[PDB]
Design a protein around this ligand. Structure first.
Ligand SMILES: *[C@@H]1O[C@H](CO[C@@H]2O[C@@H](C)[C@@H](O)[C@@H](O)[C@@H]2O)[C@@H](O)[C@H](O)[C@H]1NC(C)=O
Ligand SMILES: *[C@@H]1O[C@H](CO)[C@@H](O)[C@H](O)[C@H]1NC(C)=O
Length: 235
């Protein structure tokens, strides 16, 4: 997270850390006890068995008593995911057990099945354990930046017309660079307590207004998410 601040430990109980080979790779969020939503691009060419999902975390390096670590039983990538464009950059992770909910582990609500994306100007918050600068510097713990939704057409112009309809963007409320960075991918964009966006991609410089922060527009995938969860209910 760029231009953010460290959160009060366990104040975002839905935050998930997706590890590969022991190291934190991407973010995600707890949807249900055995379901985590993350970004499709986080799992490309990766052996699922090398992956772990950490809930109830603050300081990733500490074996915190609130931490709940799980294995991935099944990765369901969006069938129409396009790595070249980041179209449909969403996936579901079925955990090898059910998270025990409490103060440090909770769920984040999805938008309405047919909800519109948030309008330009909507105040949102984005969290992660990704880089805090363009110098590959890791945060002390879970971090969060305050962002505002940016006009999708203005965003599309800055991205030289490569955005899809199911994408939304953000900007900082002020002159300071605020947004996500590498390893924040898959983490949610929370606007009025709903997961409206999911960290997808950005430019060479984190939070740079010339290459605005692009998110997967979550509301367009709610019907798909529930159909995956439901069809995997009997197992
Ligand atoms: C995004 O914008 C596209 C148009 O972009 C413009 O045309 C291309 C060929 C380049 O010249 C580019 O720099 C221009 O900005 C639209 O075709 C596309 O439908 C738009 N996408 C959405 C979701 O609105
Ligand atoms: C879940 O998977 C991880 C990694 O494969 C493993 O260490 C853990 O024991 C598994 N848990 C259960 C309940 O099978």
């Amino acid at each position: 997270i760029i231009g953010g601040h460290e959160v009060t430990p366990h104040s975002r109980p839905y935050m998930a850390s997706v590890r590969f080979g022991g190291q934190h790779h991407c973010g995600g969020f707890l949807l249900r006890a055995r379901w985590v939503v993350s970004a499709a691009h986080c799992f490309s060419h990766r052996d699922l068995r090398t992956g772990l999902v950490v809930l109830g975390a603050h300081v990733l390096s500490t074996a915190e008593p609130t931490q709940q670590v799980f294995g991935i039983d099944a990765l369901t990538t969006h069938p129409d995911y396009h790595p070249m464009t980041h179209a449909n950059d969403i996936c579901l992770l079925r955990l090898n057990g059910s998270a025990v909910l409490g103060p440090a582990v909770g769920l984040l609500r999805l938008p309405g099945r047919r909800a519109r994306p948030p309008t330009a100007g909507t105040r949102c918050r984005v969290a992660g354990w990704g880089f805090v600068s363009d110098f590959e510097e890791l945060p002390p713990g879970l971090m969060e930046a305050k962002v505002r939704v940016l006009d999708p057409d203005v965003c599309n112009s800055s991205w030289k017309g490569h955005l899809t309809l199911t994408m939304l963007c953000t900007r900082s409320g002020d002159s300071h660079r605020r947004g996500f960075c590498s390893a924040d991918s898959g983490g949610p964009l929370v606007c009025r307590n709903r997961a409206h966006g999911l960290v997808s991609f950005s430019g060479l410089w984190c939070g740079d207004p010339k290459t605005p922060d692009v998110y997967t527009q979550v509301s367009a995938f709610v019907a798909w998410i529930w159909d995956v969860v439901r069809r995997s209910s009997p197992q």
